[PDB]
Design a protein around this ligand. Sequence first.
Ligand code: HEM
Ligand code: HEM
Lengths: 146, 140
Amino acid sequence: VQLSGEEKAAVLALWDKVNEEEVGGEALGRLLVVYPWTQRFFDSFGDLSNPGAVMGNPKVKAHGKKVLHSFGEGVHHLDNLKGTFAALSELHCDKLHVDPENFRLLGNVLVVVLARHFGKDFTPELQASYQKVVAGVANALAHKYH
Amino acid sequence: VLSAADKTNVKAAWSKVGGHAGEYGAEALERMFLGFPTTKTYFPHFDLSHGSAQVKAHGKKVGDALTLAVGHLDDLPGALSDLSNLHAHKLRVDPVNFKLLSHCLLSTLAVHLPNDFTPAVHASLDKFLSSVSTVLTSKY
Ligand code: HEM
Ligand code: HEM
């Protein structure tokens, strides 16, 4: 959201190196292994027993990719998040009934997987930034929860 | 820390960490100050400058507080019941701030140990970091 040209440029340049399948299936997988209560929502997706099943499950990968693509749309509509997610919010509150906080969670999980993937170049400076983006997307996905 | 399989990942994962505890202690703090700015008001007496021998000389203090707890998994209330009276009694630190340090410290470990920071262990550490957080916020 409200930040800086040099930070934006930075955030963006990093997002051209983000393999959305890899980092995608990784976030959703860990979310499920680290915060097991979220296994309840994605309940059809076959076997989500041990972390080995979660991680190598084709449906975690495919939805993961759908999640991270949604994130990028956001990394590129810096000034219009609320508008961007003014539907993924409705489908999350009503049809899904998902607690607002579970978002910030998947967010911090997405920052951690970026962290392992881009080592030292994932500077406290650049994560400093990402927290803002993850913060904004969270607030937008819950916007319609009143 | 709690379950066996968990107390097994923590001692194992931390041996991975080894003698880089204060360094990492340092960095996590550096990542929480910039990333989550409010936390910076708990340290008016601090050189909040990147390179600060102070922020640098406390991460080593935080690293050791954490190495000890690693070796005291069976009883955390007792082996930290000073740090418990410190953060909660003398300082009044908010229970939501510990998550910010727990997030940063984890974001960090992921930066220095990519191959070792696996899902199973990431699970465990989150737990170990929740438990220690509780102990310190226990006097509330
Ligand atoms: C970081 C914020 C999140 C983003 C950006 C995100 C993104 C998405 C996207 C793009 C879809 C696809 C919509 C479609 O198929 O038309 C979706 C669906 C879904 N999301 Fe989210 N999501 C987020 C957080 C969460 C969380 C925390 C949960 C669980 C607690 C969750 C549960 C679901 C479920 C159950 C579906 C339906 C999947 C299906 O069966 O097709 N989402 N989400
Ligand atoms: C993983 C959790 C944490 C650990 C292991 C930890 C460790 C420590 C230790 C060992 C000390 C005392 C050093 C001494 O006796 O000289 C200390 C002091 C202190 N801690 Fe933490 N801490 C944690 C969480 C936090 C959080 C979340 C904050 C607030 C954002 C915080 C703020 C402080 C402050 C203000 C002091 C006193 C600083 C001074 O004047 O020296 N701590 N911490």
